[PDB]
Design a protein around this ligand. Structure first.
Ligand code: HEM
Ligand SMILES: OC[C@H]1O[C@H](O[C@H]2[C@H](O)[C@@H](O)[C@H](OCCCCCC3CCCCC3)O[C@@H]2CO)[C@H](O)[C@@H](O)[C@@H]1O
Ligand SMILES: OC[C@H]1O[C@H](O[C@H]2[C@H](O)[C@@H](O)[C@H](OCCCCCC3CCCCC3)O[C@@H]2CO)[C@H](O)[C@@H](O)[C@@H]1O
Length: 460
């Protein structure tokens, strides 16, 4: 009754019909032979894969609760363990999502935008200072994306220099590198055998643990300084809701969901945002004309004497369409984040046993040639009608769909916009590599472009 797909061997599963290139490339290859919806065996585990804008939507939207179930990721389950907004399920998840969605919106009393505009203003100020000397943005873009989350959870930001922050940051974002490595992906398949032998997991473990300590401490500092009647941020609030569920012990709001939820926010809403920015600027180096037009749109719709604001977007459909296409091509989460089916489930003739894991190749949507003329080529065109207004697009689900749809799409949207329009507002770019020779070819649960040098040339 499971989707078709090559024969499993026990212990190993479909190890053999996979591609050395990687988890993503493997699926897409099986899709060719076995179709839009197949079953593939990751050792013991049967996984059903959803390729295409229809397949994915039919599950995530047309059957959204069936498919609301989060799945595991092997290298980090030992840290997260089913706790926290991201890896939660059933009741645990809903109450956590309900909470975070509500909470982050309100408190943190400067508005989510404002905090971003401030963070961008600092960026401009910090960038100015390098007087147009080559640099790898990676750090700063980790920094700003991290300072944003920080502002939400801790009620504060960090200077780009303060070196404690950087030490922690450095080792936070070392984890992602490792999370998306080949070793991790092998670990994914056979972690029952590998958890005993040394390998990147242990390293990932101790990087996260180390953070969960600093957080642990920021939580203890919060309780001891708390003003109930005037909360500052996400932790203040989770605490106040914690005491308001004192008498109830089947409630979900305990210390361990607090910690792994604050961590969770860093873990989802940093790299991915940051890498999108990194990638974005890489594309603006390679096709300057776009940049020119964006800088130009900025001159018309915003001018040069005020900062960008989130409202300027509605009137800047080109820029907006670039940011859209940046996400699409960046394809930064390419096989989405594992799902499970909360019930036994009817789908396309097939039946998927309860809790079976489900992988929505989002990349197959992003490069759906029915919704994008030139899917492998960078093309704002993809998002613009005959009158040059923004164009919706079914194939555009980088933040995924259904009930597990990215909780942050929003910050990230606002971030991407306000960072992009504000940087470009103030600096033009250049680099050693001529546009013609810049290469974009990156692959793991997150994709990553190459490292590159760049120049931020102040404009007067
Ligand atoms: C470019 C930026 C971002 C992208 C592309 C992105 C994409 C995604 C995707 C694809 C998922 C999984 C959707 C699924 O369940 O299949 C996800 C999950 C999530 N994202 Fe993001 N995200 C981004 C930024 C952020 C930010 C900035 C935050 C928070 C401030 C955030 C919070 C979350 C949370 C909480 C989840 C868990 C979903 C759940 O279990 O309900 N994300 N993100
Ligand atoms: O006799 C052994 C055979 O090994 C290969 O056969 C298959 C095998 O199934 C396999 O050996 C290999 O497939 C490559 C799979 C490697 C798995 C690596 C994955 C690990 C986790 C996720 C990323 C990649 O190559 C061929 C792909 O179909 C080769 O084709 C030949 O050397 C030979 O026919
Ligand atoms: O009384 C207040 C004291 O705290 C100050 O800052 C603490 C600051 O409270 C605290 O803000 C700072 O944190 C730096 C680490 C931030 C890490 C956050 C990361 C999480 C994961 C992703 C990257 C970001 O650690 C500092 C050093 O211990 C200073 O440490 C002291 O000088 C000062 O006296």
């Amino acid at each position: 009754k499971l989707p078709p797909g090559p024969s499993p061997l026990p212990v190993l599963g479909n190890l053999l019909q996979m591609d050395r290139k990687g988890l993503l490339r493997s699926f897409l290859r099986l899709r060719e032979k076995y179709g839009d919806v197949f079953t593939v065996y990751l050792g013991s585990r049967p996984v059903v894969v959803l390729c295409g804008t229809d397949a994915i939507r039919e599950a995530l939207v047309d059957q959204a609760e069936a498919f609301s179930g989060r799945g595991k990721i092997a290298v980090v389950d030992p840290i997260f363990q089913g706790y926290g907004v991201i890896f939660a399920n059933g009741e645990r998840w809903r109450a956590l999502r309900r909470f975070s969605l509500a909470t982050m919106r309100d408190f943190g009393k400067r508005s989510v935008e404002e905090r971003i505009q401030e963070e961008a203003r600092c960026l401009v100020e910090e960038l100015r200072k390098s007087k147009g000397a080559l640099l790898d943005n990676t750090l700063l873009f980790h920094s700003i994306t991290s300072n944003i989350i920080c502002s939400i959870v801790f009620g504060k930001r960090f200077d780009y220099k303060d070196p404690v922050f950087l030490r922690l940051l450095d080792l936070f974002f070392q984890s992602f590198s490792l999370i998306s490595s080949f070793s991790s992906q092998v670990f994914e398949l056979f972690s029952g055998f590998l958890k005993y032998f040394p390998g990147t997991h242990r390293q990932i473990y101790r990087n996260l643990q180390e953070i969960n300590t600093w957080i642990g401490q920021s939580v203890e500092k919060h309780r001891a300084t708390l003003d109930p009647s005037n909360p500052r941020d996400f932790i203040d609030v989770y605490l106040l809701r914690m005491e308001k569920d004192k008498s109830d012990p089947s409630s979900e709001f305990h210390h361990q969901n607090l910690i792994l939820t604050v961590l969770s926010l860093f873990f989802a809403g940093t790299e991915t945002t940051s890498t999108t920015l990194r990638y974005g600027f890489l594309l603006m180096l390679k096709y300057p004309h776009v940049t020119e037009r964006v800088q130009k749109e900025i001159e018309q719709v915003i001018g040069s004497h005020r900062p960008p604001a989130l409202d300027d977007r509605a009137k800047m459909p080109y820029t907006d369409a670039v940011i859209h296409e940046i996400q699409r091509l960046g394809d930064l989460i390419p096989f989405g984040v594992p799902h499970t089916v909360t019930k036994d489930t009817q789908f396309r003739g097939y039946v998927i046993p309860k809790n079976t894991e489900v992988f929505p190749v989002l990349s197959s949507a992003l490069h759906d040639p029915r919704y994008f003329e030139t899917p492998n080529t960078f093309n704002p065109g993809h998002f613009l009608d005959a009158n040059g207004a923004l164009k919706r697009n079914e194939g555009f689900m980088p933040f995924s769909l259904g009930k597990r749809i990215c909780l942050g799409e929003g910050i990230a949207r606002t971030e991407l916009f306000l960072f992009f329009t504000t940087i470009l507002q103030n600096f033009s770019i250049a680099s050693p590599v001529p546009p013609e020779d810049i290469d974009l070819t990156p692959s793991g649960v997150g994709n990553v472009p190459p490292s590159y040098q760049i120049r931020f040339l102040a404009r007067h």
